[PDB]
Amino acid sequence: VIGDFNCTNFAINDLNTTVPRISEYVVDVSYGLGTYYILDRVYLNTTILFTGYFPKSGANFRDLSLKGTTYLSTLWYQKPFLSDFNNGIFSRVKNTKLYVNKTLYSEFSTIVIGSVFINNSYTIVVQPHNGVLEITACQYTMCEYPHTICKSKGSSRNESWHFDKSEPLCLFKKNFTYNVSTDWLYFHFYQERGTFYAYYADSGMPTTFLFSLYLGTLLSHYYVLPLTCNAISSNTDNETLQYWVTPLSKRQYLLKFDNRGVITNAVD
């Protein structure tokens, strides 16, 4: 289970549907993908040695996305899917693009980052809403079996990942835009000296600072929520979710900046 709140007993089973698939693709930082722009700094026309929270060059990713129809498996809410956060993660996220009539809708898995996922502790939630990325850190009463839905093509489930009827205490709450036409989003989520840091991109480039938040407490776990949908399968659209993850470590990189201050190259 994720949290301890019994939000539902509708269509729960114990089926071993899948395990996290390993990417044929590997971390290749040679053009700055898997790096980030350093906070609010600009570096121009120079090479920097920077020790940051970076993925290991040549590492694989695990796809942690789960697509459901009606049933949720209890085995989805355990290791290997419920994961130790350690220093942090680099995410490569497929923007799943669905069409209703001719209109584009953007879907991808919500990620939650926390410790025990009980409402006496802060859970960071990063959730798409069709070109809006809602980010919160809010003492959520997380469900035992949390999931999101396709709002575009619908689900046989109501959306359910927390049960807070009154608004819970928030440390952070902000919305960021992203380009709904993209193929990939990239994220860094890491922690240092009790502060959480988030970065994102939506084009295959070094990530840009979203926010940072002082927690003091270590984040110990993360979990990519299942998404339940009547679409996103071979019998309906041949579309897929993908939420690829690889661990960060405290690591020295060479970063090369051009005269525009763009990271054109990096070395692990």
Ligand X SMILES: *[C@@H]1O[C@H](CO)[C@@H](O)[C@H](O)[C@H]1NC(C)=O
Ligand Y SMILES: *[C@@H]1O[C@H](CO)[C@@H](O[C@@H]2O[C@H](CO)[C@@H](O[C@@H]3O[C@H](CO[C@H]4O[C@H](CO)[C@@H](O)[C@H](O)[C@@H]4O)[C@@H](O)[C@H](O[C@H]4O[C@H](CO)[C@@H](O)[C@H](O)[C@@H]4O)[C@@H]3O)[C@H](O)[C@H]2NC(C)=O)[C@H](O)[C@H]1NC(C)=O
Ligand Z SMILES: *[C@@H]1O[C@H](CO)[C@@H](O[C@@H]2O[C@H](CO)[C@@H](O)[C@H](O)[C@H]2NC(C)=O)[C@H](O)[C@H]1NC(C)=O
Residue 148 pairs in a beta bridge with 227
From the CB of 171, what's the least distance to ligand Y, in Å? 16
Q: Which is nearer to ligand Y, 87 or 115 (CB)?
A: 115
As measured in angstroms, the least distance from the Cβ of 24 to ligand Z is 35
Selection from ligand Y, ligand X, ligand Z, none that 4 binds (CB < 5 to 8 A by kind) is: ligand Y
Is 259 a binder of ligand X (CB under 6 A)? yes
Closest CA to 141 of 254, 5, 2, 243: 5
Q: What are phi and psi of 76, to 5 degrees?
A: -70, -20
The CA–CA distances, whole Å, from 229 to 12, 78, 93, 206, 241 equal 16, 21, 18, 31, 11
Residues that bind ligand Z (CB under 6 A): 6, 9, 129, 132, 134, 173, 175
Torsion of CA 20, 24, 26, 30, to 10 degrees: -150
Helices then strands, counting H and E runs in the chain, come out as 0, 23
Q: Which does 161 bind (CB under 5 to 8 A by kind): ligand X, ligand Z, ligand Y, none?
A: none
Site for ligand Y in 135-164 (CB under 6 A): 141, 164
What's the CA gap between 244 and 65, in Å, rounded?
8
| Calpha distance 153→18 (Å, rounded) | 23
Instruction: Pick one of ligand X, ligand Z, ligand Y, none as the site partner of residue 164 (Cβ within 5 to 8 A by kind).
Output: ligand Y
Which partner from the list ligand Y, ligand Z, ligand X, none does 175 bind, CB cut-off 5 to 8 Å by kind? ligand Z
One-character DSSP codes across 36-67: B--TT----SEEEEEEEEEEPTT---EE---E
Write the interaction track for ligand Y spanning residues 164-183; mark x where CB under 6 A is met and - where it is not: x-------------------
158 binds, among ligand X, ligand Z, ligand Y, none (CB under 5 to 8 A by kind): none
Residues that bind ligand Y (CB under 6 A): 4-6, 119, 141, 164
